[PDB]
């Protein structure tokens, strides 16, 4: 994950930190995570460089029912959508057509420009029934 | 928009309010809506309605980019999306089986128990563009 900004050690302890992790997670939690492995960098530094990162692209962002937000990084780097297990944090990335075409469809139909459709789905995984 | 408790001129008042208006607004924005008219109802005692109005789903509620939720009372009472405007707030009900057949097809191979699928799109009009 290159960042844009000059080459220091922050940019890529935060890098190398959210692709060791492989589930959404918020600003807090990622710098409790960092600060607990040693890397010692600051809150306000994570929320700039996830910023700038998410402004890049090369990471996938997500808004919490409550209202905070959670981040993940995807290899794959083609558009896709989310389904999110909230009991335990879990991401998986999946991609259908249909939901391409009936946003096209209804971009026609309606005479919108353009458009940005938000599809981030949630529900429950197999684990949680089991005890 | 019934209330499971006594009616009162308050809550009718914001009921009233709910429905004179379709577009998309907050609490904020709906009781200064409210106090410009000459209601003169509280802050807490709007959001306190608002709750429960989603509680008993009479009303459709919205994240903001920003995250502070928008709401909407929303003639249609059965499952349906809202197709938004940020410059404009207008909302269009749009439903499609499609996107719900894909939901419920990726929930099953993936073995979910439920799906609480959160969609929402968001484009700009063609008199948006025009000036
Ligand atoms: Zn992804
Ligand atoms: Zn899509
Ligand atoms: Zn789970
Ligand atoms: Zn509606
Ligand atoms: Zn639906
Ligand atoms: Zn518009």
């Given at each position: ?19 060791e ?13 960092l600060?607990h492995?040693?890397?010692?960098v ?7 460089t996830?910023q700038?990162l ?11 029912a409550?209202?905070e937000s959670?981040?993940?990084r995807?290899?794959?780097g083609?558009?896709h959508?989310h389904?999110v ?7 998986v ?12 469809a209804?971009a026609?139909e ?10 981030e ?11």
């Amino acid at each position: 994950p290159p960042v844009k900004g000059r080459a220091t050690r922050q940019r890529a302890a935060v890098s190398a930190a959210l692709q060791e992790v492989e589930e959404f997670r918020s600003a807090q939690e990622l710098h409790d995570m960092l600060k607990h492995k040693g890397d010692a960098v600051g809150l306000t530094t994570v929320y700039r460089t996830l910023q700038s990162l998410a402004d890049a692209g090369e990471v996938d962002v997500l808004r919490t029912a409550e209202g905070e937000s959670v981040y993940r990084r995807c290899s794959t780097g083609d558009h896709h959508h989310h389904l999110v297990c909230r009991a335990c944090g879990k991401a998986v990335e999946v991609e259908g057509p249909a939901v391409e075409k009936w946003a096209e469809a209804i971009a026609a139909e309606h005479g919108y420009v353009n458009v940005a459709h938000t599809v981030e789905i949630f529900g429950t995984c197999a684990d949680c029934a089991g005890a």
